[PDB]
Amino acid sequence: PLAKDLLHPSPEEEKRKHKKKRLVQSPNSYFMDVKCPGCYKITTVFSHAQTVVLCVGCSTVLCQPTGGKARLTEGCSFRRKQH
């Protein structure tokens, strides 16, 4: 390839590229509305949390910090927030 459309890359190619090496850099992370099996109130949690996010009143604990993405505990539905 000599001719490549540098201005208009297709989404798959720049979804693949390292987050800094894209044309306009953008994070691979997100925020997610996540709820407990018992309670009704929802909590906003970061994709790569890196803290332990306690359910308000320490009713339980939602996430656990790891290398990359924060592991959400078993029996907690989540809906990733978008803008």
Partner: protein
Amino acid sequence: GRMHAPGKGLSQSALPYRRSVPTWLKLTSDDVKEQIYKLAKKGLTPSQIGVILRDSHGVAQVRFVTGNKILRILKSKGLAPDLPEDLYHLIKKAVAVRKHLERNRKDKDAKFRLILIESRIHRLARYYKTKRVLPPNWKYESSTASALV
């Protein structure tokens, strides 16, 4: 590449284009300012306040929710600690290495790594002296460096 290492690590944050605060966030400038005040007065560095906010409360960046940087909020309110929270951490490490090295005398590696950390303390201390964050008399001296926590 790293200041005192042969590594060429590419691993840091990537801010999005849109600086606009998203719709789901209901925390206003004064609500997060009350939150930042509470966290700092509990005893917590501008770094640890920032992660607490984005992890638990869902505050993308405080510079967009508020109009200020966390330290400019805290130093305006007068809750900013005197000697900065990177100079602090370099001194704290340097004391921790020297305390180890005073016991384990034949630790030639700890001796070399202590020299590297102290070269980094001097180099950041003089930046803060020029920018008038420290007095011109401020000294890093291992004799009474433990007096600084």
